[PDB]
C-alpha cells in the first residue's frame, strides 16, 4: 500500500 516495487519483483 506504500511502495509497490520494494520487494523481490520490480517490473523491467
Amino acid at each position, epitope marked *: *500500500q*506504500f511502495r509497490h516495487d520494494s520487494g523481490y519483483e520490480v517490473h523491467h
Partner: antibody
Amino acid sequence: QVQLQQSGAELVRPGSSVKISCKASGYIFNNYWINWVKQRPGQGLEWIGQIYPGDGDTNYNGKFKGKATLTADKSSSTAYMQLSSLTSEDSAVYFCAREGYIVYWGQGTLVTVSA
Amino acid sequence: DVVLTQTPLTLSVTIGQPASISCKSSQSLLYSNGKTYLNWLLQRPGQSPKRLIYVVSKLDSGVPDRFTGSGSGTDFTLKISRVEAEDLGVYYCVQGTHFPFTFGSGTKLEIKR
C-alpha cells in the same frame, strides 16, 4: 488466490501482551513485504511497521518502537505482531497487508483491552 | 514525518456527479529511482482498505477507470468522473517515499440522494 488470514478477536487484560498472526498463502512468502496497520475505533489509519520474510528485515514507525515486535515464520508462511504492555490506547483493529504491484489485505483482528 | 493534508475532509455527492479530493504533502514525494510513492486507498465501513491508485496515476486492476489520479512533487488529486453508490467510504492518500510511511486523515464520501 492470495489470502492473508488473520487470527481471531482478542481480549487482553490491561498490562498484558498479545501476539496476533497473519497466515499467508497463494504467493512466495519470502518475496514480499508485510505491513501492519492500526485503526483505533472511529479514527484514521496508522502505519506500525513492516517485515520482509525472506531476510527478516524490519522497519518500524518510531511511535510503535517498544510496543510492537514483528516476526515471520518462513516455514509456515505466517507473520506475527506482538503488542506489549497493553492499555486502552491499544484497543483497535489491526490489519496486515502484502505490499506489491497488487496489494492484498487481511480481514483485520480486533483487540479489546479490558479487565 | 511527512504530513499529508487532504481537502475536503467530507464530500456529499449526488449519483452521477464527479468529485475531487486534494492531497498535499509537506515534502517532495519524488524517490531516488524517479518514482513518486503517493497512493490512494478506499475503506468502506465493514471492510478492509483497498488500494485504488499507486504511484500517482496507475490504476489498480479491477478498479473502474472512473477513478484517476494526478499530481507531482507535493500536490496530488484523486478524481472520480461520475460517482456511483458503491463508491461510499473513506478515501486516504498515503506515502511510501519517506520512512516512516504516513497516511492522510481521510476524506469521507457520502452519497446525496
